[PDB]
């Protein structure tokens, strides 16, 4: 009789699910028109045609994907924001993590963020995103775990890209799961 160990994917897939998510949201949040409608994860995902931006995401997320794997991350926030780097659309992926159901309910996620353009009011185009990595340690403790990437550097919690406000949450999702408490919600301003 064979008792046996396990092989978790727990903390990493999230951000790369965010990858799909962000590749979707960068599309849906109307902050990408260089996006193209494609097919992935059995949904009408809208991705980017630029392999250059694909590698930009490789740097931004897929370099920190095992670095984001620390469980200290509270709010993986896609701040959808103007030139001032302050949110209008706080896609707060409040990752309340209790450590294929993940895509079983991110089916609803991707699908409804896709529908979010029927909920998201007309956000002005020409506004970018920042990936605010809310950890359990304030003011960007342990620069190494955030600047893991050699070619891709990181910065501390400088006063501009550290704060957010105007938290009107219409919880477009509350999709609790087994591994994840993906309390995603779109806090409008």
């Amino acid at each position: 009789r064979q008792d046996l160990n396990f092989g978790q994917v727990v903390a990493d897939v999230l951000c790369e699910f965010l990858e799909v998510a962000v590749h979707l949201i960068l599309y849906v949040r109307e902050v990408y028109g260089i996006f193209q409608k494609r097919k992935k994860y059995n949904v009408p995902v809208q991705m980017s045609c630029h392999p250059e931006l694909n590698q930009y995401i490789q740097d931004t997320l897929h370099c920190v994907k095992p670095l984001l794997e620390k469980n200290d991350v509270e709010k993986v926030v896609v701040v959808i924001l103007d030139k001032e780097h302050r949110p209008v659309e706080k896609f707060v992926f409040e990752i309340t993590q209790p450590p294929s159901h993940v895509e079983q309910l991110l089916r609803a996620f991707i699908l409804k963020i896709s529908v979010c353009d029927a909920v998201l009011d007309h956000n002005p185009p020409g506004c970018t995103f920042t990936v605010l990595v809310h950890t359990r340690e304030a003011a960007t403790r342990n620069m190494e775990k955030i600047q893991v990437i050699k070619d891709f550097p990181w910065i501390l919690a400088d006063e501009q890209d550290v704060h957010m406000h105007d938290p009107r949450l219409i919880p477009l999702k509350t999709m609790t799961s087994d591994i994840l408490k993906m309390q995603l919600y779109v806090e409008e301003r």
Binding site: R1, Q2, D3, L4, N5, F6, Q8, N71, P99
Partner: protein, 398 residues
Amino acid sequence: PTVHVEVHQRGSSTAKKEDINLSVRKLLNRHNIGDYTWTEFDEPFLTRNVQSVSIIDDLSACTVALHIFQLNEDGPSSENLEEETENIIAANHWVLPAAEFHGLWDSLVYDVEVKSHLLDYVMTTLLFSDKNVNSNLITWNRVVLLHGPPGTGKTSLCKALAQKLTIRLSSRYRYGQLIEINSHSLFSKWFSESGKLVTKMFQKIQDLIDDKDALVFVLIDQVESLTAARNACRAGTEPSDAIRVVNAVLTQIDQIKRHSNVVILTTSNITEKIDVAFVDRADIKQYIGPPSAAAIFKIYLSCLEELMKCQIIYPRQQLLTLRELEMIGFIENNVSKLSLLLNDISRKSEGLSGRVLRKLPFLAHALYVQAPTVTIEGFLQALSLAVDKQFEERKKLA
């Protein structure tokens, strides 16, 4: 011929240490006094200070420094280990001498002198540590392993000792400790976290160890849970994780080989499953078996004295000890009948462990003749029957 004395000083009393040292010198050297204990009477102020004075094995020309102590009345202190959501106590933590372990070291009776060897081991450890003998030329890893048939006083000697030493080594080491390890918290379902936190637990023990006055006593009960033999089979049975923990304990049992304020008391009763690289690191490897006739008689003496003190027994009568019994010549007299008959009960009940030997009065008064106060003239017989029952209770179990 040095003879030791322990003095229990209450938690209520507050008189400083040396004051009660000199007080007990006045006491003992006004009486000017194998093991005979006195209570805290015969003088007012010491009655307000001390509780009991006990001697351990005649003119007492050379005495010891009085071992004077307060029991701590706070039990375990659960200490989790995981960074987040431990929810499983990984290590209980007494600060000796605790309250519960009191009188434990004296109830246990071995008539083979396991206590003597297991005691002098630490004294010689100190002797070689203080005079600075080179590690390379003579060395030892500090591990004690105890094995035998189940229920013979193996976990009760790994804890009655971690108190007795702190009483003996009070002048040198000023507070003992005791860490009871919860083996089943160390393992983990996750891929490599099964040993990656055994190292964390031994790191915490080390962090406790650095204070060079502490006298840490790491205790591992039922070691086979922690060092199961490495060669089970090639299949998924005992996954790759159970090959790398048993050699993660072994790489920590020797990284705390250099300190001299550490002992590692460990118990197990099924030895043939302990890995062989652990069954050799051990420094004493002591075997304690079910008690013999004299130990049985002493156990029954203790039980009877406790009951007739607690009045679950009719007006009490005195009992004779093997020394006095041999001195009188086994003659049938006005008192010796009880001694001889209890001797037969002892001479009948060999082969049983300690647990049953201590249950037996309770069953013999719980099943057989029951009348809330029972005379010893009958109660001894009421025990004998119970003895036979156990043997019968074995045969029907085959």
